[PDB]
Design a protein around this nucleic acid. Structure first.
Lengths: 203, 199, 55, 97
RNA sequence: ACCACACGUCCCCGAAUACAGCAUAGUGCUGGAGUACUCCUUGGAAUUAAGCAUAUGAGUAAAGGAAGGAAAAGAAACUAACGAGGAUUCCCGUAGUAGCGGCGAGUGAACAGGGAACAGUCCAACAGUGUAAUUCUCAAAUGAGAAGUUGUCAAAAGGAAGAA
RNA sequence: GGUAAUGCACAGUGAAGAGGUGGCAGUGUGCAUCUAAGACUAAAUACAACAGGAGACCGAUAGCAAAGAAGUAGGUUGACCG
RNA sequence: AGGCGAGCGCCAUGAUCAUCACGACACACUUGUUUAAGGAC
């Protein structure tokens, strides 16, 4: 079917047709304001894996992020302490650049829930992403059977608590001996379980 | 208020329009400057295909055949279902990318029309190569609206036909021969020439 | 241990106990945190971790 | 200390069970075959529409000059894995033939 | 008389708004307060090494963002090499062990074995073509219009128990 | 803790449809076990304000700072202090 | 595929890929010369 052909072309990022399209689109994205609404998804296959349908009460927004590492916020390089903690540059953020895009779109579109996000381009200065949003106060959505779950009160601000596809990846969750640092639920949950003194009745 | 000239719009820097009042102008600056850029640079062979399309004369000829196989409206559909089944299986023209690609793959389709002005283009990009491999004839049309008018409904990406009534067969065969000339017969040569900047 | 207190140090002809920072009340300059002070903290405060039962 | 008393030879012994043979799953139904065919077909069309990438061109050029060991080193540095390099060389070779 | 349960009335300032951002066919929604406990970032020094610079205190304090009566996690791209087991969380335990460390001071997990409680499922890939069968609005007793082919649409009432 | 890289990032580079792992770097080859890059999930677990019940606890210089109109009388230019 | 000194290195010129200056255009980028000027610096 049709969605298979699109997958194979979207994967060939150094084909002549894809180099053409990436160049023209990345030009346009930078002429626009830093967060803006899109007419529809740039990639139909990718948006549909992640749960988009063309029904009322769903939207695509597009966001840009500046590239490279993030320096320490100190004046004149003065850190008032020990020399091993005096480095300013070559310090890399804990979260992906994608996570910043999701966090900023959620502030602007405060009446809606952030579902999922994907990559759409890069250049020397910026990296560009599309975010899928849903409106929980909409009659069409309240009566759906596939995304009606987003209306549960616990689903407010998923992006702020590291629950979305872009924000989750820095937590270090997984199964097996390679992820012992998160047994319990999180890094801090593991810390508590390891740094507690248990004092029974008969002892 | 005032319509700006082409010269003005090409002069303005979009990043310096910032107020809520100015947003419509920002949109127009971007639209015009994009056109100038696309005309300046070379197109790869596959994208260059969608620059070649039927004349308004041929479009008339084709539409004047196809219009006789119009799909049912909801009013018609209701009536049909109150009545009993009668007569032979109808011939109807078919619509939408998902169904069309299935019929090409099953080798059911017999002739296909495709629209050029589609964004993003990656939706239709592969159709000519698939048509050439299955050996099905096709033709390209300028706008999605040209197709909508044939079937008396909303614009679409492509239309398809899988059967021929004997009444129409003579005209049909002639049309296919015209199309093969402009499109399918020329394919292997086309896939090697890059689109020139435009004069 | 609630109050804001600090020692006055030597040179004032007073014992170097911590004292309460205040003004406008008779509480100014009184002796704060130690076990030998009125309203101060007890020696070795009693605590829930004691072993209550026996085997 | 109740550790390290047996020799390695006696630790290797085992109880004599009766085994069950594995149920082989070799039959592939008609519909599964068509499914696989269509996927492989789609992969052709992409290559036809968009062509080869820059390092694939450079690689194939070296293969014409019989620069086999240069091509090997080049591909290792591009893809990371010596296994991926060995596979991609074999696919490129077959394309040229 | 007076009391107890509910309702009616409820001045001015304050998010304080005749506003800002944003969605729908339309109605609208967010903002401030609280934050003991839970999740996500950012990130010290006193102190110990009888000095001190790696290390320690500590991913702790402080500062920011966010939610609920709990929160997070969760059904193996998992362990194991036995004659093997089988989601997540919690308790007893392996263990002050294997190891990390100016191999100094000091740091430091996992499977097993015994229990508490137990439950599994969805989307994409992949929707009737002898007709979008789908959602909404107004009318009407059968018509007009909006969304949608860049793909909509995959079914049950129902009950006596249990607790405060 | 993770030791010739346990996890997370940034820049270059960038796959295959078949891939991932088996606590010491590399190359080859059988064998065992799984299926990442989309989502949901009860019970068993943690702890303020407010309410109720108990105690080998304290008894007006004690016990919460506060057993009365107590965060009150009163004080700082102010943050805050009492 | 040519030529020199008791197949060697040395001297000729002919095909194959990058590549450093120099030109001449306009599309990224720059500037209130802005219905404009620069320019792959």
């Amino acid at each position: 079917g049709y969605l298979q052909y699109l997958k194979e072309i979207r994967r060939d990022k150094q084909s002549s047709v894809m180099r053409y399209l990436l160049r023209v689109r990345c030009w346009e994205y930078r002429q626009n304001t830093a967060i803006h609404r899109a007419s529809g998804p740039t990639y139909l296959d990718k948006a549909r894996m992640l749960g988009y349908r063309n029904i009322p009460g769903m939207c695509i927004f597009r966001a840009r992020v500046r590239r490279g590492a993030r320096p320490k916020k100190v004046l004149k390089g003065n850190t008032h302490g020990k020399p091993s903690k005096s480095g300013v540059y070559q310090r890399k953020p804990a979260k992906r650049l994608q996570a910043f895009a999701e966090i900023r779109v959620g502030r602007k579109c405060s009446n809606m829930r952030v579902f999922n996000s994907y990559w759409v381009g890069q250049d020397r200065v910026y990296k560009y992403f599309e975010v899928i949003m849903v409106d929980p106060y909409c009659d069409r959505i309240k009566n759906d059977k596939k995304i009606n779950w987003l209306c549960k009160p616990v689903m407010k601000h998923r992006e702020a608590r590291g629950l979305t596809n872009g924000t989750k990846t820095s937590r270090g969750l997984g199964k097996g001996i390679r992820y012992n640092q998160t047994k319990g639920g999180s890094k801090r949950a593991a810390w508590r379980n390891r740094n507690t003194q248990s004092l029974r009745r008969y002892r | 208020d005032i319509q700006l000239t082409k010269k003005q719009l090409l002069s303005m820097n979009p990043r310096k329009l910032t107020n809520k009042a100015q947003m419509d102008t920002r949109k127009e600056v971007i639209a015009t400057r994009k056109e100038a850029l696309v005309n300046a640079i070379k197109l790869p062979p596959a994208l260059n295909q969608f620059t070649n399309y039927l004349s308004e004369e041929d479009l008339k000829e084709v539409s004047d055949i196809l219009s006789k196989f119009r799909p049912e409206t909801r009013k018609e559909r209701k009536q049909r279902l109150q009545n009993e089944r009668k007569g032979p299986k109808p011939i109807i023209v078919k619509q939408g990318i998902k169904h069309v690609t299935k019929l090409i793959e099953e080798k059911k389709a017999k002739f296909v029309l495709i629209a050029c002005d589609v964004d993003p283009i990656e939706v239709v990009l592969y159709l000519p190569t698939l048509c050439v491999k299955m050996g099905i004839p096709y033709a390209l049309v300028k706008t999605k609206e040209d197709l909508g008018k044939i079937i008396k409904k909303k614009p679409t990406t492509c239309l398809c036909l899988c059967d021929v009534s004997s009444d129409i067969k003579s005209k049909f065969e002639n049309v296919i021969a015209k199309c093969n000339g402009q499109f399918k017969d020329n394919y292997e040569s086309a896939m090697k020439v890059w689109g020139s900047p435009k004069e | 241990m609630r109050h804001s207190a600090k020692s006055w140090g030597t040179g004032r002809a007073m014992a170097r106990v911590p004292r309460v920072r205040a003004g406008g009340t008779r509480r100014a300059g009184q002796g704060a945190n130690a076990n030998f002070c009125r309203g101060g903290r007890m020696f070795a405060p009693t605590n829930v971790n004691r072993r209550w039962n026996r085997k | 200390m109740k550790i390290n008393k047996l020799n390695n030879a006696s630790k290797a012994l085992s109880y004599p069970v009766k085994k069950l043979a594995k149920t082989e799953k070799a039959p592939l139904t008609e519909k599964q075959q068509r499914s696989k065919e269509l996927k492989k077909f789609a992969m052709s069309i992409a290559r036809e529409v968009g062509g080869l990438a820059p390092y694939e061109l450079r690689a194939t050029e070296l293969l014409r000059r019989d620069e086999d060991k240069r091509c090997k080193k080049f591909m290792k540095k591009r893809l990371g894995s010596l296994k991926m390099a060995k596979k991609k060389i074999e696919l490129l070779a077959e394309e040229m033939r």
